[PDB]
UniProtKB/Swiss-Prot annotation:
One of its GO terms (molecular function) is lysozyme activity. InterPro entries: Endolysin_T4_type, Glyco_hydro_24, Lysozyme-like_dom_sf, Lysozyme_dom_sf, Phage_lysozyme-like, T4-type_lysozyme. Its EC number is 3.2.1.17. Induction: Expressed late in the viral replication. This is Endolysin. The active site is at E11 (proton donor/acceptor), D20 (proton donor/acceptor). Optimum pH is 7.3. It comes from Enterobacteria phage T4 (Bacteriophage T4). Belongs to the glycosyl hydrolase 24 family. The lineage of its organism: Viruses, Duplodnaviria, Heunggongvirae, Uroviricota, Caudoviricetes. One of its GO terms (biological process) is defense response to bacterium.
Length: 162
């Protein structure tokens, strides 16, 4: 298991524009296109992202290409984030993948707001962090996925994904 397989499990793969769990237009492997209500705006962002007139459909390859960019960007976002980097640096490889998953889902900003959880993780107080992480809208809205990520932080293993 690795970050790519992990997120491919959490996000799925869809080749036609779709609405995510928040009702936003997305495509591929969890690639958000727009928070706007307009399908056109979404088709427009899509074309600009792929570089061709897609008509709201992309191939597997294109989906994977967006995915690789998005994973790269999440990592690079963490490394540039003063609140995030130090956490990330302190973690083992498995747990870093959990932090990346969160950032990919919610954005660097979103994650950087979990101040208390972050400190707990930095301190390696796993059970406590797990409990604090669960007191969030993130957990209440997407509980099955949140449980997977939380177990990952708690145990430092990939069990939740097997
Ligand atoms: Cl893009
Ligand atoms: Cl879920």
């Amino acid at each position: 298991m690795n970050i790519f397989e992990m997120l491919r499990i959490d996000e799925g793969l869809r080749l036609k524009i779709y609405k995510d769990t928040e009702g936003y237009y997305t495509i591929g492997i969890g690639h958000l296109l727009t928070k706007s209500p307009s399908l056109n705006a979404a088709k427009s962002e899509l074309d600009k992202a792929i570089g061709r007139n897609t008509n709201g459909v992309i191939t597997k390859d294109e989906a994977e290409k967006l995915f690789n960019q998005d994973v790269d960007a999440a990592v690079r976002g963490i490394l540039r984030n003063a609140k995030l980097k130090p956490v990330y640096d302190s973690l083992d490889a498995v747990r870093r993948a959990a932090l990346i998953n969160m950032v990919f889902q919610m954005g660097e900003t979103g994650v950087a707001g979990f101040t208390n959880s972050l400190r707990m993780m930095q301190q390696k107080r796993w059970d406590e962090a797990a409990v604090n992480l669960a007191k969030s809208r993130w957990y209440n809205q997407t509980p099955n996925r949140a449980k997977r990520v939380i177990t990952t932080f708690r145990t430092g293993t990939w069990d939740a994904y097997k």
